[PDB]
Design an enzyme around this catalytic site. Structure first.
Site, PDB file in Angstrom:
ATOM      1  N   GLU A  53       0.803  -1.219   0.000  1.00  0.00           N
ATOM      2  CA  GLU A  53       0.000   0.000   0.000  1.00  0.00           C
ATOM      3  C   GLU A  53       0.839   1.273   0.000  1.00  0.00           C
ATOM      4  O   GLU A  53       0.437   2.267  -0.607  1.00  0.00           O
ATOM      5  CB  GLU A  53      -0.999  -0.006   1.160  1.00  0.00           C
TER       6      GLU A  53
ATOM      7  N   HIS B  65       1.761   2.364  -3.488  1.00  0.00           N
ATOM      8  CA  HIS B  65       0.666   3.091  -4.152  1.00  0.00           C
ATOM      9  C   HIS B  65       0.731   4.543  -3.701  1.00  0.00           C
ATOM     10  O   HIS B  65       0.578   5.456  -4.521  1.00  0.00           O
ATOM     11  CB  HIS B  65      -0.696   2.526  -3.775  1.00  0.00           C
TER      12      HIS B  65
ATOM     13  N   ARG C 290       2.903 -14.410  -2.745  1.00  0.00           N
ATOM     14  CA  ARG C 290       2.399 -15.152  -3.910  1.00  0.00           C
ATOM     15  C   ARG C 290       3.282 -14.971  -5.151  1.00  0.00           C
ATOM     16  O   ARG C 290       4.058 -14.016  -5.228  1.00  0.00           O
ATOM     17  CB  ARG C 290       0.939 -14.748  -4.216  1.00  0.00           C
TER      18      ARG C 290
END
Ligand SMILES: [Zn+2]
EC number: 3.4.24.69
Length: 432
Positions: free
Chosen positions: A230, A233, A364
């Site tokens: 985050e 961003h 991931r």
């Protein structure tokens, strides 16, 4: 060097690190909330994000049969002064974890030094304007029981608690008439909805690829990496590079369309499925926007809202932020090499993948990954479970190897399944 401040929720207002501040979307409307300066330019308001939401949106679904395990609701989160303190201390610990290594230290420094341009597209080329929601936030300087007096202060980031869905962290920018300063080269005060306890789960990774069904490994995420995702961003939003509505149609697990902004932020093998053409258009848009900023810097004469602000000092701060060059007559211009370096640093340098590699955190394989049910981490403030230095993957407890401290089948004491339905969904997904 980044200093990470300390305070408790109940600590009194001092008009320095603990204030009553009016958030961007509440500008002009005299509603102030208790804000805590965790580092320079970064604030935390340990309250729930209610902007553009009704109180009923925070409630759980009517019963078990219509619940979505991928979306967790709890209207009682952050309802007490003590829960608001647990939030603050968890955030201080997570920020201390981010600065514990060089990569995250520089991320925080880039966020702090990435001050929003003193204006937006509505502001004349010859003027600096601090009287807008994307550059300043109002600070209450009067004592309780007195008529409200304010002062506008600069800020870069304001982190709030979650919105209706706890496990859905999101970084938001300010839009005026469908135009965002954070997407137009200017940059603007970024906001975030964050929840540390409710984390994402995955099973996409390099392992499991051809491995036996029983030998499939499922892990939970580190709240520090989720926060760092985050914060990337926020970084794009502060440098005015946030990529607007641009869906990309496709190892990989899902074929579903994802935003260009989300792909570059995740990184790794993700910017590769983007057509060389789309990738080049995103680069050219950033250059054209930075060319607009340089033209403004060459034309700026006055500061309309603050006729005290020194033009030369701020022009220099913006020259450093955007890595612009100056000639013998003071004229600014873009240097393709320094631009290329800054661009590659903002878009390809600070990614979720290489932050995960550098910090030994398991994440991931692709963003094109299946949504597995979230889990709740019982206590992040206990060093027997989670540390500033190592995360869940603690060396003493033999959790550092094969990322076993994140493995759901192994570190069963660091988390708890939200419900029996969450486990039942997880079991089907782990063994398809
Ligand atoms: Zn994201």
């Amino acid at each position: 060097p980044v200093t990470i401040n300390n305070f408790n929720y109940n600590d009194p207002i001092d008009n320095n690190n603990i204030i009553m501040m009016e958030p961007p979307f509440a500008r002009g409307t005299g509603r102030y909330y208790k804000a805590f300066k965790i580092t320079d330019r970064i604030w935390i308001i340990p309250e729930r994000y209610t902007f553009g939401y009704k109180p009923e949106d925070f409630n759980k679904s009517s019963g078990i049969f219509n619940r979505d395990v991928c979306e967790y609701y709890d209207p009682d989160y952050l309802n007490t002064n003590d829960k608001k303190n647990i939030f603050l201390q968890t955030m201080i610990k997570l920020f201390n974890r981010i600065k514990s290594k060089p990569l995250g230290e520089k991320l925080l420094e880039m966020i702090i030094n990435g001050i929003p341009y003193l204006g937006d597209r509505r502001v004349p080329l010859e003027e600096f304007n601090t009287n807008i929601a994307s550059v300043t936030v109002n600070k209450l300087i009067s004592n309780p029981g007195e008529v409200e007096r304010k002062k506008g202060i600069f800020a870069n980031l304001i982190i709030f608690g979650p919105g209706p869905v706890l496990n859905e962290n999101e970084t938001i920018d300010i839009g005026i008439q469908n135009h965002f300063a954070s997407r137009e080269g200017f940059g603007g005060i970024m906001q975030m909805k964050f929840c540390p306890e409710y984390v994402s789960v995955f099973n996409n990774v390099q392992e499991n690829k051809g491995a036996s069904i029983f030998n499939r490994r499922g892990y939970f995420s580190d709240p520090a990496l989720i926060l760092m995702h985050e914060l990337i961003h926020v970084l794009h939003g502060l440098y005015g590079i946030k990529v607007d509505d641009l869906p990309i149609v496709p190892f990989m697990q899902s074929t579903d369309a994802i935003q260009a902004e989300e792909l570059y932020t995740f990184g790794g093998q993700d910017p590769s499925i983007i057509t060389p053409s789309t990738d080049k258009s995103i680069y050219d848009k950033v250059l054209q926007n930075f060319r607009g900023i340089v033209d403004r810097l060459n034309k700026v004469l006055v500061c309309i809202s603050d006729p005290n602000i020194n033009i030369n000092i701020y022009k220099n701060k913006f020259k450093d932020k955007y890595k612009f060059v100056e000639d013998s007559e003071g004229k600014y211009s873009i240097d393709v090499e320094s631009f290329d370096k800054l661009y590659k640093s903002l878009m390809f340098g600070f990614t979720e993948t290489n932050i995960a590699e550098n910090y030994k955190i398991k994440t991931r394989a692709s963003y094109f990954s299946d949504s597995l049910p979230p889990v709740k981490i019982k206590n992040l403030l206990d060093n027997e479970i989670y540390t500033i230095e190592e995360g869940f993957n603690i060396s003493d407890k033999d959790m550092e190897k094969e990322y076993r401290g994140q493995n759901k089948a192994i570190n069963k004491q660091a988390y708890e399944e939200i419900s029996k339905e969450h486990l039942a969904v997880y079991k089907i997904q782990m063994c398809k």
